[PDB]
Ligand binder design. Structure first.
Ligand SMILES: [Mg+2]
Ligand SMILES: [Mg+2]
Ligand SMILES: [Mg+2]
Ligand SMILES: [Mg+2]
Ligand SMILES: [Mg+2]
Ligand SMILES: [Mg+2]
Ligand SMILES: [Mg+2]
Ligand SMILES: [Mg+2]
Ligand SMILES: [Mg+2]
Ligand SMILES: [Mg+2]
Ligand SMILES: [Mg+2]
Ligand SMILES: [Mg+2]
Ligand SMILES: [Mg+2]
Ligand SMILES: [Mg+2]
Ligand SMILES: [Mg+2]
Ligand SMILES: [Mg+2]
Lengths: 142, 171, 258, 187
RNA sequence: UAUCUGGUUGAUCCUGCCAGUAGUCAUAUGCUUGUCUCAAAGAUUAAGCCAUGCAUGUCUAAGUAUAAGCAAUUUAUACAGUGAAACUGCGAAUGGCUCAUUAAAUCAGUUAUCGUUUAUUUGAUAGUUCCUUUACUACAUGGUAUAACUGUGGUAAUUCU
RNA sequence: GAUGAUUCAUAAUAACUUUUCGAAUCGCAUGGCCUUGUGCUGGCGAUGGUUCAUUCAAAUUUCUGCCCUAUCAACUUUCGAUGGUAGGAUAGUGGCCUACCAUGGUUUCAACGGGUAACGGGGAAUAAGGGUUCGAUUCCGGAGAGGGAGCCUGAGAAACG
RNA sequence: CCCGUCGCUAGUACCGAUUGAAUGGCUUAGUGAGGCCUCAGGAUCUGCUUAGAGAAGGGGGCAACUCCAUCUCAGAGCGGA
């Protein structure tokens, strides 16, 4: 959020070409889409300047499959957070339950700002990395 | 000796083992894509050979008692049509069907001649087949063209009635 | 492993074929065709186990090679050709015409139809798209591709297919008040009118359905096949008419006729 | 050989996996192309399902597109000047995707003369009508036209030469040209 | 088919274990063994080692036949019936066997490919190529092989050649 | 036009190609119309063939679920460990691999290690109710072919007749 | 009320000084077969471009001189596998 152009390659959206001949307002062509399933595309994606190839709104991924909910327990990666899904597991012999949990690494777009303690909902995508298969679609706590 | 054949291009007088493939001598593959490491003798003539295979390229003065005296005729004549036309030095119109070599056989007192089947021969059936293929192409092209034109007039009719209902809309 | 399987053990075959668990280790594996191998009926099990016109698979092959049976008007001298839902089967010796429709017990019925009805079949459209050079097409439930369809035909409709040509005669849309056939699931074989459909964006649209005795049920949209408006169907329904009497009413009805 | 699977790596917890399976063929990997410049040499690779794949080794020319001008010409490649993954590819003159190269630029100047009638850098009536009608489009940019004076244009490789065999690209323009220019002129 | 009983004491009531008691698509073993139906069967130790034989080949009116193969004709002096070999095409990746490895691995139920390959089957589907486009030519149809075969051979030996 | 959603289907423009495919194939029947040439024309098949859809599949993949052990408390990370950007390779996604960068990732809710006389499941035996023990073995999935590794052919094999 | 030391017989595990040999998972340094990709290599085979030279047959001589030639010598080449 201090520069866009940090890497050695030119960061740009693929096949979105801004014609150097013309001169208008609305400075650059920015491609964005709605991810579907009633998730609202955030204004920071529509108006921003970040590139973020793995974004569910401006980038080349699609949300399909499970929609999950967790609480952010780690933000120390770059564009990646770890959420914690807590559930109760039933044991039939003793006729009662026990607390269990899983950690899910999810990708977070620069449209969203999360801290530790926020509740997020994530949507399944194709494999992003070795462990990441989920992508943040709405941050709605603090 | 030890029966191993000679391979052209090995260029050494001893034996060496090569991984051999199809379309290459000293090996016949028993399976598709099968390769096999076989021993083979080089192309350089040494004292270790049991037999040398020689071919005569140019006759000397004397007649060899096994070789230039006697003859074997070739076993089969040409079978493809232009092969017959090259064998007899024919021309295009010659009606080659009469220049077919017939081999008389006698199983008994009966004799019969058993000529080959000429292949790649022009015939009314091949011409009928060509005429059918060229006809089928134009028939399908015309059929697709009327299907496209009928669908386009269907779209025009639907768009016209939609515009008429849109005329009923907006006062 | 290592490639496609070519055998099919008995006790792995679909249960609605009604193949007895003894008399052989194998079942007739349906060859690749217009129908999925679970929701299909090979001609060997139709000719031998349902019509009893043969005693062996060898006799079924002997019937097939003299081009007697033809399925959807094409000859099909294959032993394990998958005949599926709404296929017509013509036996010109005996001049017989069958349609593969389910009875309410969930099995394929011997539904004899007349000669006028054997001239068509219904198909549920599975996708409508634009092929190459911008030509639209539909794909019916048995994989027939039909070019230049009507623009009103969207998915989950039924189109009437001519079976001498591959052309479309007419079509039934999808809304409330439409007579449906359930092909798939627990309620396989039942006929009822659709009351309403549930949007469920993200997977597995449900549809609520009530038969003539006012018994409602619900089914996924994958297993529903619209067959007409309420009153007339577009085909002849088999005996029973998809009613699903309970077992109490069924033994009462059996003790009537016994 | 080269395997493309994930069962040989550690788990996310960090444990060492046991060897579940021998290396399967549907997860194979193949050696790189390392496409050099000059004297075109295309090998074929038979891949999964038939489906031939063209390893270009040592490609010479390419089809390069001028995007603001909407054309593309078959142009000779001079050499790679920048690569965001590795400097040894720039040194060894390997051609991959996203390689910044220099191209010949003479077909582009021939098209620009034949289309607009003004020369870059420093007869019939029909051509006069055409050249007058598309006026006020013959003023492209400063940076590209200075390259046209120098006879070498900066292009970016958009094709994958080890996969398709072809080395296609587009001429650098605008802010992307300024970015790679600051990268190139950086000491 | 919601069941217990014998053993600590001179006698008692307990804790408590041992012992009995019933079953076992749990094995083995002993003794005995008439009939009908039905049936598992080298798992455990050694995923130890193997003599011999067999277990994957395949032809239709419809790819190629001059077998110096067999038949009988009478359509047919180009072939035309049956049919070895061989070439071509498919198949040999299914089946059968075993349970060594393997502990978020396999697997089970439930999802996804808007992240891809797919012989075959079934349904659709290809007027554009005379590559310098007045002939530079064959389109009533163009070029090579090569097998089987015939003949000459090598090695103690091989589905060698 | 479709979808919850696409830079999707599809169309267009400019070029590219080392230039893919666009029938020199086979069997029966042998008609039709003529200015009568061995003229033009024509049926039912068989095999092949580009692309799409279908079917038989495959490869990855989401969620949850596994026996005993703390006389295993910290494990992973120069040799990828967790993520970012580009490339390469792949049928395709992805540290799958490479270059550069950042310092992450798991764990008392039991990570990591060890053991298993551990292939998993449908299931079996015995049970009032709850359970306990077993499942090499008729079906489903996986793996292996003395041990390892590498590959050819092919749609499909890291194939063992 | 039959066991604390010492004693006899049998059995079961433990500690073993013992620089004894045999397995196996890893691991340190040094080598490293085979196929595969690649840089070369070029036994051989083949297709076309000249036509100088060597035995017979047409258009002028019906007496050295101009076209096909059965085939090589090969150089003034381009390839391909
Ligand atoms: Mg079958
Ligand atoms: Mg006492
Ligand atoms: Mg007493
Ligand atoms: Mg007891
Ligand atoms: Mg198997
Ligand atoms: Mg087809
Ligand atoms: Mg990448
Ligand atoms: Mg990366
Ligand atoms: Mg085990
Ligand atoms: Mg065992
Ligand atoms: Mg099994
Ligand atoms: Mg295997
Ligand atoms: Mg063994
Ligand atoms: Mg092997
Ligand atoms: Mg064996
Ligand atoms: Mg005493």
């Amino acid at each position: 959020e201090l520069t866009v152009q940090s890497e050695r390659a030119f960061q740009k959206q693929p096949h979105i070409f801004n014609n150097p001949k013309v001169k208008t307002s609305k400075r650059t062509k920015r491609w964005y889409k709605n991810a579907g399933l009633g998730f609202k595309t955030p204004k920071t994606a529509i108006e921003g300047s970040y590139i973020d190839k793995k974004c569910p709104f401006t980038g080349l991924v699609s949300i399909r499959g499970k929609i999950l909910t967790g609480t952010v327990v780690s933000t120390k990666m770059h564009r990646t957070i770890v959420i914690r899904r807590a559930y109760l597991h039933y044991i039939p012999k003793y006729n009662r339950y026990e607390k269990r949990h899983k950690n899910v690494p999810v990708h977070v777009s620069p449209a969203f700002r999360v801290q530790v303690g926020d509740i997020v909902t994530v949507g399944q995508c194709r494999p992003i990395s070795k462990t990441v298969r989920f992508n943040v679609v709405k941050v709605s706590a603090a | 000796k030890q029966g191993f054949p000679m391979k052209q291009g090995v260029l050494l007088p001893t034996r060496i083992k090569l991984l051999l493939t199809k379309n290459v001598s000293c090996y016949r593959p028993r399976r598709d894509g099968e390769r096999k490491r076989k021993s083979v003798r080089g192309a350089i003539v040494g004292p270790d050979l049991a037999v040398l295979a020689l071919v005569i390229v140019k006759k000397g003065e004397q007649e060899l008692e096994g070789l230039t005296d006697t003859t074997v005729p070739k076993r089969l004549g040409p079978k493809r049509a232009n092969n017959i036309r090259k064998f007899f030095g024919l021309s295009k119109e010659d009606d080659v069907r009469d220049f077919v070599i017939r081999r008389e056989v006698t199983k008994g007192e009966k004799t019969y001649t058993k000529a080959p089947k000429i292949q790649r021969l022009v015939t009314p059936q091949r011409l009928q087949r060509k005429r059918h293929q060229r006809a089928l192409k134009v028939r399908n092209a015309q059929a697709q063209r009327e299907a496209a034109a009928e669908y386009a007039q269907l779209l025009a009719k639907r768009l016209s009635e939609r515009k008429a209902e849109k005329a009923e809309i907006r006062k | 492993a290592r490639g496609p399987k070519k055998h099919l053990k008995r006790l792995a075959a679909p249960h609605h074929w009604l193949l007895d668990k003894l008399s052989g280790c194998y079942a007739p594996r349906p060859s690749a065709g217009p129908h999925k191998l679970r929701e299909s009926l090979p001609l060997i099990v139709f000719l031998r186990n349902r019509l009893k016109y043969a005693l062996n698979g060898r006799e079924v092959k002997a019937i097939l090679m003299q081009r007697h049976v033809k399925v959807d008007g094409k000859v099909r001298t294959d032993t394990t050709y998958p005949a599926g839902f709404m296929d017509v089967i013509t036996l010109d010796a005996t001049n017989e015409n069958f349609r593969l429709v389910y009875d309410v017990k969930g099995r394929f019925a011997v539904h004899r139809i007349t000669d006028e009805e054997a001239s068509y079949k219904l198909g549920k459209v599975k996708k409508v798209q634009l092929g190459k050079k911008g030509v639209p097409y539909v794909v019916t439930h048995d994989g027939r591709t039909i070019r230049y369809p009507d623009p009103n035909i969207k998915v989950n409709d039924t189109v009437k297919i001519d079976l001498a040509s591959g052309k479309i005669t007419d079509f039934i849309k999808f809304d409330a008040g439409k007579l449906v056939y359930v092909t798939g699931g627990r309620n396989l074989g039942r006929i009822g009118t659709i009351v309403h459909k549930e949007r469920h964006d993200g997977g597995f649209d449900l549809v609520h359905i009530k038969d003539s005795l006012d018994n409602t049920f619900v089914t996924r949209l994958n297993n529903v096949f619209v067959i007409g408006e309420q009153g007339k169907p577009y085909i002849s329904l088999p005996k029973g008419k998809g009613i699903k009497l309970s077992i109490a009413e069924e033994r009462d009805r059996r003790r009537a006729q016994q | 050989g080269i395997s493309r699977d994930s069962r040989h790596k550690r788990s996310a917890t960090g444990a060492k996996r046991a060897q579940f399976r021998k290396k399967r063929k549907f997860e194979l990997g193949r050696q790189p192309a390392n496409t050099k410049i000059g004297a075109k040499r295309i090998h074929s690779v038979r891949t999964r399902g038939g489906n031939k794949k063209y390893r270009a080794l040592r490609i010479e020319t390419g089809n390069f597109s001028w995007a603001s001008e909407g054309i593309s010409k078959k142009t000779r490649i001079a050499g790679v000047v920048y690569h965001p993954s590795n400097n040894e590819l720039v040194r060894t003159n390997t051609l991959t995707k996203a390689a910044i190269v220099q191209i010949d630029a003479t077909p582009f100047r021939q098209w620009f003369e034949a289309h607009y009638g003004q020369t870059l850098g420093k007869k019939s009536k029909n051509a006069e009508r055409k050249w007058a009608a598309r006026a006020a489009s013959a003023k492209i940019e400063s940076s590209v036209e200075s390259q046209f004076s120098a006879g070498r244009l900066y292009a970016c490789i958009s094709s994958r030469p080890g996969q398709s065999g072809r080395c296609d690209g587009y001429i650098l323009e605008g802010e992307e040209l300024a970015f790679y220019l600051r990268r190139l002129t950086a000491k």
